[model samples]
Target: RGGRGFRGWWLASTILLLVAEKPSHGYELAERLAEFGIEIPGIGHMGNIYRVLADLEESGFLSTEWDTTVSPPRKIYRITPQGKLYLREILRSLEDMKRRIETLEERIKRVLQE
Candidate 1:
């Protein structure tokens, strides 16, 4: 709704999958996403990462807690059993989306050939 559509949605999904792989803070999530060529550019408050984290936590798909032993406490996020199940749904949906993309690519190739 912020004029960010499919790309934003997919980015959020990617964040979920990454966090589902292992518990990570927002900074770590942003770093890993950069590895995937998704550096959020100039406005980098780990905006989307935190948004998705909060959404997932609110939905009970994830459980969050703060670790206060460090010099500064950091909030940690981990997937719940519900999160794992949700992650499976995410995977299936992604696979479906992949097929759709492939189909579109093939169609474009044929169109160019014609």
Candidate 2:
């Protein structure tokens, strides 16, 4: 089979945007997904979320702080200035893609109706 693209590019991108809005932990991100109507079946693919966060941090897209409120402690991600700029660019590109796809779908519907 051909190499597959990410299973949830839009969802992942939305998560990144949410993180960029402010520093947050994974649980917060999960709740944000719920707000956005994303029903993640399990946390298995969530490793990818952490991986993306780490990659973004390594690339200077974000920074992290430890939340020591609890015993184990959790890391909260804060998006860097570069990340905001990058996220804006990504959102613009994704919006353009969405518009194009929507237009194509509408056109197909019209053709099918004809």
Candidate 3:
């Protein structure tokens, strides 16, 4: 099953989708998130980032493993099918919002604010 409403759950969506992009660990995940300027808490030792990771796991949107392919071992995060539908739900909303926002952009910028 999946969670509902998905409000503060947007950041969780990024992590969810990122894992969908590739199965990676915490550090790489944080770095990749930075590529989108998601400037999260504490970067190298992030707070909100880890917390979101936990929430996604708790809600059954993500899964992990202690991957041995690296030194000292690390948790390789991956996505679940539930996670796909969950993010799709959010992405659908974003698409609708994109349409509205662009519509506004076309209107507002054309207005005479002078």
Question: Per-residue alpha-carbon lDDT of model 2 for 1-114, expressed as tens digits?
Answer: 211144455555666788877688777677766666534443334334666667678888789999999868989998888888878888788789889989999999999999
Output the number of the TM-score-best candidate.
1
Estimate the lDDT of model 3.
0.74
Worst 10-residue lDDT window for candidate 1 reads 38-47
| Steric clashes per prediction | 0, 0, 0
* TM-score, candidate number 2: 0.71
Give the alpha carbon lDDT tens digit for every residue of 1-114 in model 1.
231456666666677778888787887888887776644454332346777788889999889988788757879898889988887887898899889989999999999999
Clashing residue pairs in candidate 3 are none
The C-alpha local distance difference test score for the whole of candidate 1 amounts to 0.77
Predict model 2's lDDT versus the native: 0.72
Output the worst ten-in-a-row residue range by lDDT, candidate 3.
Answer: 38-47
Query: What is the descending lDDT order?
Result: 1, 3, 2
Displacement of residue 114 (Cα, Å) in model 3 is 9.2
Positional deviation of residue 62's Cα in model 2 after best superposition, in angstroms: 0.9
RMSD of 3: 5.4
